[PDB]
Paper text:
Ciliary motility is regulated by the conserved nexin-dynein regulatory complex (N-DRC), which links adjacent doublet microtubules and regulates and coordinates the activity of outer doublet complexes. The N-DRC is a large 1.5-MDa, ~50-nm-long Y-shaped complex with two main regions: the base plate and linker regions. The N-DRC bridges neighboring DMTs and restricts sliding motions between DMTs. Here, using cryo-electron microscopy in conjunction with biochemical cross-linking and integrative modeling, we localize 12 DRC subunits in the N-DRC structure of Tetrahymena thermophila.
In this study, we revealed the molecular architecture of the N-DRC of T. thermophila by an integrative modeling approach. Importantly, our data identified an additional N-DRC component, DRC12. Loss of DRC3 in the drc3 mutant strain led to the loss of part of the distal domain (based on our study, the distal domain lost in the drc3 mutant represents DRC9/10 complex). We propose DRC3 binds to DRC4 first, leading to the assembly of DRC9/10 heterodimers. As a result, DRC4 plays a crucial role in assembling the N-DRC distal domain. Regulatory signals can be sent to dynein e through the N-terminus of DRC9. In addition, DRC10 may send signals to dynein g through DRC3. Therefore, the DRC9/10 coiled-coil may be the important regulatory hub in the N-DRC that regulates dyneins g and e by receiving the signal from CCDC96/113. In active cilia, the N-DRC linker region is not well observed by cryo-ET, probably because of its flexibility.
Residue numbers in the entry:
A (entry chain P): 104 to 408
B (entry chain R): 1 to 202
C (entry chain K): 387 to 434
Amino acid sequence: SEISGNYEADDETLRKIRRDLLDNINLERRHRDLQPVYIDLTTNNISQYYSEYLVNNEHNQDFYENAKVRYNNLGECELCHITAKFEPDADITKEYIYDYFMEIGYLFLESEEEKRIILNPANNHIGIGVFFDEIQIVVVLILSEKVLCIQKISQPEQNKIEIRGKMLDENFGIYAIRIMNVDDQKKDIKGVGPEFIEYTRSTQEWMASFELELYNQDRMAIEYYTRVSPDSIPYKKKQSKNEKLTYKHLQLRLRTPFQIYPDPKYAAEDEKERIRKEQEILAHEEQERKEREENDAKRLKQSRK
Amino acid sequence: MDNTGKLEKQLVTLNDGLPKKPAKEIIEELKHHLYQDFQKFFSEEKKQQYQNNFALFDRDNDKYINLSELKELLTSVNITFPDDELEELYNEFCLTSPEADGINEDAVFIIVSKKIRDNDKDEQLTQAFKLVEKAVNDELAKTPNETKEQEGYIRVEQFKELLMTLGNRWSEEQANEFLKDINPKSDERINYLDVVKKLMKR
Amino acid sequence: EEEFRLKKEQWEIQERRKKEAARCILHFLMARKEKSKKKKKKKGKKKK
């Protein structure tokens, strides 16, 4: 307070922190023919939780699996953790925050286990969680392998949902879209098959069009299912009302809590950051363009010998 | 080269590390979360008052009550429970209480907590219906030449975005069955009154 | 004075909470029972 005021983290600042962590891991991947890691909201949430816990505690896996059971995790997910203090004589502000997070990212870059796992070709989904205290900052990752990847989750209309996702598995297509109550899994919540799914085999991109109104919208998770033979999947077929889809033959893939992906704040902040990036970069490219122009002007004089 | 395929299947294994911890610790942690969500909405006064219906009925003074005592407590707290549901819950409670022929004073707390969670979800559902009807009426007022018959009837595209607001989330893939259950009559227009009727039928 | 008045209103609220606690306290010993029978005489004269 008087001497040590509270260091309440900027929500915008931490959002940029994790976004830049993801982009940096994507660059590291692209360095050697590796696809950038995509955004997994469930892994992002779990990593945020574990980073918050780690900042004043130590690496604990029991809490990790307890959170897994709480969120009903699906698929194998591998965890990464680092807890690096702050330098005893290092000054701290936003700029030092950004630079310290980049340095911690590099420290991740110099770990062979961490470099392998966070760049292992086996998995295709990445999530980041960052937290900090008076002393140290904790950075944690969750890596998951899934068949169907989430790419967009927005709000088209007042009461229209619109979520787009590209299928990462060529032999599996989005045939089942159903979910069970996170609080009471036994209770049939909601789901349908291909009568409202637009799937492109050539691109493996599937889009969902459905209906849904305002009831209890905070504290449960998704149940992403997949089935073999997307070709055998009757996409966009108006099935007779006397037939019900059989989801037991359908294999679940990805139990994910539901949140704005991307959240308007997240995407808007990323847009602003990138756009300022290109503006300053174009000023830069003007700087070196005029530099080369005048250098060649001097060279034409020096070419008088 | 030649862009050799290929269609390959990545086994999505549900191998999410079943806990190695003793199950007793996990059950204790779930009990702790139950206590947390109980104190969340249960105020200190209600928390201090609900015990007014357990002990004396607990005649043997060893902190237990049977079905009759639990039902008497529930009626004494001014909120009732079903006979079959009460029997189901009590037998489930006794499953882990082999040496006790009754439920503890915390058993009534947990029963009331779950009942209140369910009921409050119900009032949240009702309030959401009222708000959705208000929004639909406002949008209709935005169009001064649309038939009032649509009052209570909504379009396909105005029936999708309302599960990102509050309470206990329904995600993307939680928005397909109830359409089939209602079965719009080949008209792509849905009545939220039908939803009111069908949500509470389970 | 305002801080102390808020605290004492909280005091009244928690006093009523404790009154409900007592209401739940008069509720524990209906009939039982089993005769703590024999002897507790010895009360050594060294007193308070």
